[PDB]
Design an enzyme around this catalytic site. Structure first.
Site, mmCIF file in Angstrom:
data_model
loop_
_atom_site.group_PDB
_atom_site.id
_atom_site.type_symbol
_atom_site.label_atom_id
_atom_site.label_comp_id
_atom_site.label_asym_id
_atom_site.label_seq_id
_atom_site.Cartn_x
_atom_site.Cartn_y
_atom_site.Cartn_z
ATOM 1 N N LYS A 112 17.275 21.015 2.994
ATOM 2 C CA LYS A 112 18.706 20.778 2.877
ATOM 3 C C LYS A 112 18.986 19.665 1.879
ATOM 4 O O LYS A 112 19.874 19.795 1.023
ATOM 5 C CB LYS A 112 19.298 20.437 4.246
ATOM 6 C CG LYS A 112 19.381 21.606 5.203
ATOM 7 C CD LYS A 112 20.121 21.228 6.496
ATOM 8 C CE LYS A 112 19.343 20.242 7.360
ATOM 9 N NZ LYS A 112 17.969 20.737 7.693
ATOM 10 N N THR A 113 18.210 18.575 1.952
ATOM 11 C CA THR A 113 18.498 17.398 1.139
ATOM 12 C C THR A 113 18.295 17.675 -0.343
ATOM 13 O O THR A 113 19.138 17.313 -1.170
ATOM 14 C CB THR A 113 17.640 16.221 1.580
ATOM 15 O OG1 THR A 113 17.916 15.948 2.951
ATOM 16 C CG2 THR A 113 18.007 14.980 0.749
ATOM 17 N N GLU A 156 24.946 18.816 3.653
ATOM 18 C CA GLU A 156 23.940 19.324 4.571
ATOM 19 C C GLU A 156 24.594 19.790 5.860
ATOM 20 O O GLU A 156 25.457 19.101 6.418
ATOM 21 C CB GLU A 156 22.925 18.244 4.922
ATOM 22 C CG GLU A 156 22.297 17.487 3.789
ATOM 23 C CD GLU A 156 21.208 16.550 4.297
ATOM 24 O OE1 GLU A 156 21.145 16.335 5.528
ATOM 25 O OE2 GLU A 156 20.420 16.030 3.479
#
Ligand SMILES: Cn1nc(Nc2nc(N[C@@H](CO)c3ccccc3)nc3[nH]ncc23)cc1C(C)(C)C
Ligand SMILES: [Cl-]
Length: 304
Positions: A112-113, A156
């Site tokens: 996600k990051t 996110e």
């Protein structure tokens, strides 16, 4: 509701949310234990700052935002609870900022990051200066301008967060579905899978689901998604695919294939197929948004 009071506004996840609410036109107040350059910037932007926690700080507030759980030790919270002023957690307020912007939700257990950062990088190369959220912290490239100024908010989406099913994105990515957070869903993996379907069903009919079909569980729930969908991966049947992956140093090169477009050569400065996949997710979102090939190429290769 028009005035929002932050308890512990100098906190690192709190100032960014207060700044975006200032940018949206709300009245924002906050309290903190010690004055900081963080509370100075917020005051410059219109926030009313109180030093020290006294119940009179919560007067006028239509909602309170608190850093963690509702700890009724603090007098401002206790005074709001007494007056039936709602007290929402930080993560819920953060999640609702997406209703005011063109929200891009990056969900999935892993990646996600980096994907959120790659998207932010490409959108910025296209001049769109997006606000983005990684690790609960709001960011944007251009220092001086208020957070939230951009049309775009890239965030996110964590399947273990209480506010997962309350995001309202225009676009949602699902990189993969792992069992890391089975405990959130009663230790049942089938319940976890069904939550990702429910999540994608929070897109509007004009939204877009971006689905990594190299993950077998994403591929499994795909026929359940009644929303416009673009698949990506190394798989031969994906809509957006990477071929001819190669290396020149710490840089990875590959050719991305896209429907109704010519092959596009692209590089990213991070190794591993998982970063090829992070780039494909990015390429799908930037393409659907109409960003140029040049901004895609520059955003991906200039990413540190
Ligand atoms: C920084 N980063 N980025 C990740 N991104 C993605 N990972 C996976 N799968 C993961 C595991 O399933 C994976 C791991 C290794 C090779 C291939 C796939 N699939 C994705 N699809 N789209 C984006 C994406 C994963 C990571 C870690 C933390 C694991 C190093
Ligand atoms: Cl409450």
């Amino acid at each position: 509701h028009r005035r929002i009071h932050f308890v512990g506004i100098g906190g690192a996840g709190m100032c960014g949310i207060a700044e975006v609410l200032l940018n949206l036109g709300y009245e924002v107040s906050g309290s903190d234990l010690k004055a900081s350059a963080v509370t100075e910037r917020l005051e410059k932007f219109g926030a009313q700052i109180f030093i020290g926690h006294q119940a009179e700080n919560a007067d006028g507030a239509d909602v309170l935002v608190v850093s963690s759980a509702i700890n009724r030790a603090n007098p401002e919270v206790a005074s709001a609870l007494e007056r039936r002023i709602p007290v929402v957690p930080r993560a819920e307020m953060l999640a609702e900022l997406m209703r005011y912007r063109h929200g891009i939700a990056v969900a999935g257990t892993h990646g996600k990051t980096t994907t959120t950062s790659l998207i932010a990088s490409v959108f910025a190369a296209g001049g769109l200066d997006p606000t983005f959220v990684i690790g609960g912290r709001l960011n944007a490239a251009g220092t001086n301008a208020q957070l939230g100024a951009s049309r775009y908010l890239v965030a996110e989406a964590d399947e273990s967060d209480a506010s997962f099913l309350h995001l309202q994105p225009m676009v949602a990515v699902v990189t993969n579905i792992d069992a890391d957070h089975m405990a959130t869903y009663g230790g049942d993996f089938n319940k976890l899978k069904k939550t990702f379907v429910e999540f994608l069903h929070n897109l509007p009919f004009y939204g877009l689901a971006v689905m990594c079909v190299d993950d077998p569980v994403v591929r499994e729930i795909l026929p359940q998604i009644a929303r416009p969908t673009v698949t990506y991966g190394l798989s031969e049947d994906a809509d957006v695919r990477a071929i001819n992956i190669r290396q020149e140093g710490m840089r990875t090169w590959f050719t991305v294939l896209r429907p109704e477009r010519e092959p596009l050569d692209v590089s990213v400065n991070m190794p591993g197929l998982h970063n090829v996949l992070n780039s494909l997710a990015t390429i799908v979102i930037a393409t659907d948004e109409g960003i140029s090939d040049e901004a895609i190429v520059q955003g991906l290769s200039g990413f540190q």
